[PDB]
Design a protein around this ligand. Structure first.
Ligand SMILES: COc1cc2c(cc1-c1c(C)noc1C)[nH]c1nc(C)nc(-c3ccnc4ccccc34)c12
Length: 113
């Protein structure tokens, strides 16, 4: 009951995060950070656990998340990596804050029974 409902909510949230209406700020989070293409030679020294929306999508499709808290932790890990690696005034950090606001506002509405 509660768990299947929670996972439909998580799937809905991730689908919205991929939607065209949020694409102008969500697109850097769609795929794993390409360290070689972006020349981020210190990325793996700073970030021990990379995360992105396509990875979260694959984990939802594989039924890897047992509940909403685990899904939530991966979404927040993705934003935390962005805040850790990039300076706070970077354009990508402004995009992260906007996409995190979309996520947190809907994740707050998670079914609780
Ligand atoms: C600066 O952070 C990123 C940039 C890009 C990214 C991921 C990250 C990233 C990091 C690091 N930590 O968390 C995220 C999210 N994926 C990309 N794909 C492409 C093709 N271009 C860019 C990009 C290149 C140059 N300036 C930009 C300015 C703003 C936004 C994107 C870019 C990026």
């Amino acid at each position: 009951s509660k768990v299947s409902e929670q996972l439909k909510c998580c799937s809905g949230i991730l689908k919205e995060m991929f939607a065209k209406k949020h694409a102008a700020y969500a697109w850097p989070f769609y795929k794993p950070v390409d360290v070689e293409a972006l020349g981020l030679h210190d990325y793996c020294d700073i970030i021990k656990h990379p995360m992105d929306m396509s990875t979260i999508k694959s984990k939802l499709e594989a039924r890897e998340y047992r509940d909403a808290q685990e899904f939530g932790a991966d979404v927040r890990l993705m934003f935390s990596n962005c805040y850790k690696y990039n300076p706070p005034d970077h354009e990508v950090v402004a995009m992260a804050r906007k996409l995190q606001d979309v996520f947190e506002m809907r994740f707050a509405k998670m079914p609780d029974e």
